[PDB]
Structure formats: C-alpha cells, structure tokens
C-alpha cells in the first residue's frame, strides 16, 4: 500500500552536510513527483524542492542553492542533501507525493533534524508510581520519566503498543543543563494494577538507544 517514510540522522553539527532519505511504498517514482517540506519549531510548513518523474528538479530560491534533490527509481528512494546548515535549519522534514496537477496527496510522518555541536546523549528512564497503593481511589496513575537526552525526538509506547487508552505523553522540556526530558503517563483501574504488568517502551534513535522499564 501507499506509504512514505523519511529517514536520516537527527543530529548534525555545523560541519554542514545534511542527508535524508524518503522511501516510497506504493507509488513508482517514474510516475509521481516527490516534494520536500520542512516545519521549523513553532512555525508553518515550508517547501524545499521537488524532483519530477523525469528526474528534473526545482528548488526554492531562499535556500540559496544549498539544497540538492536526487532519486534512485530502482530503490524507491528520494534523497535530500543540504549544505551550509545554520541552527535555522533545525526542523522536522517531510516528503510528500506530488499527484495530478498538482497536489500533495500522500505525506510521510516526518523526521526531526537538529543542528548543533552538542554531543548526543541517551536518556535515563525512571518509573512514575505513587508512594503507596490507595484502595479508595478506583483509578491509579502510572508513568515513566525519560530524562537527560539530546537531541529532542523521543518516542514512548506502553505495553509494546498494546496499551493506548489513557496514555498521555507530554512534550519535552529544555532543562537548565541543555538536556531534554519528557514524561509519559497512563491512567489505569486501580483494582487491576496488581495483576497485569505495565512497561513503557522508550526509543531514542539519535543515540541508538532502546530502553524498556517496568512500572509496578
């Protein structure tokens, strides 16, 4: 089926070559165009360039010709290269499928890129369980604290994805150390907490880090 997925490094230092990859599932690149869009933090969508089925490209002038887009039809991959990166190039980058004349009918989930000289650090995961089990409260709150990571993209899932009801994952905050941290919590029926196990699944791709912490 038709799907687009961006991929690439999340941390790039100001030695400034960025390289991303857009993989297309159910759409031949000889029949569709592919457009790259980026969204800086707290900003709107900004297109970068498009590569057409024939292979020709068009680029935004504001990118000062630092952006180059290529593709390999046999590999179903579209490549994005950007040089002379500033911190202004920190954003989440989307690739979309150009169909008809013209519209973006299929969008990828986006990939986050951070431009900084700081080193990448994996996070620590700590359980968030109440001081004691309360019989009066019919609902108890569980969670896990993901602390001291960089760069920002961190994903959290509960019971390997099986538990989604009542799952709230909070946006990250920037600590005074410059390291990010976020909390993810879930509300559960308190009568059932002693039987089933609850584990939060934390993935931090910039540090090749995966951690599965059980929460009693």
């Amino acid at each position: 089926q038709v799907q687009l997925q961006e991929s690439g490094p999340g941390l790039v230092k100001p030695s400034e070559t960025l390289s991303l990859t857009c993989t297309v599932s159910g759409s031949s690149l000889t029949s569709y165009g592919v457009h790259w869009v980026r969204q800086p933090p707290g900003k709107g969508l900004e297109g970068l360039g498009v590569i057409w089925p024939g292979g020709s490209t068009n680029y935004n002038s504001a990118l000062m010709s630092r952006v180059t887009i290529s593709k390999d039809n046999s590999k179903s991959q579209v490549s994005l290269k950007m040089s002379s990166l500033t911190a202004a190039d920190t954003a989440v980058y989307y690739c979309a499928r150009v169909t008809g004349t013209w519209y973006f009918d299929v969008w990828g989930q986006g990939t986050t890129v951070t431009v900084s000289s700081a080193s990448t650090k994996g996070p620590s995961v700590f359980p968030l369980a109440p001081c004691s089990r309360s019989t009066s409260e019919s609902t108890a709150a569980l969670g896990c604290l993901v602390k001291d990571y960089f760069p920002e993209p961190v994903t959290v899932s509960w019971n390997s994805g099986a538990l989604t009801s009542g799952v709230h994952t909070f946006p990250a905050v920037l600590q005074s150390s410059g390291l990010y941290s976020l909390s993810s919590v879930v509300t559960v029926p308190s009568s059932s907490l002693g039987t089933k196990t609850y584990t939060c699944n934390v993935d931090h791709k910039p540090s090749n880090t995966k951690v599965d912490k059980r929460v009693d």
Binding site: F126, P127, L128, A129, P130, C131, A141, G143, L145
Partner: peptide, 15 residues
Amino acid sequence: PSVFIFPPSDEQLKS
C-alpha cells in the same frame, strides 16, 4: 483535573 503525585524513584535517588 484529576491530580496525582509521584515520589522520586529509588533508582533515580542512586544517581
């Protein structure tokens, strides 16, 4: 809102 509080984890105290 439904309010909850969480004590610092023993593992975090060791850090």
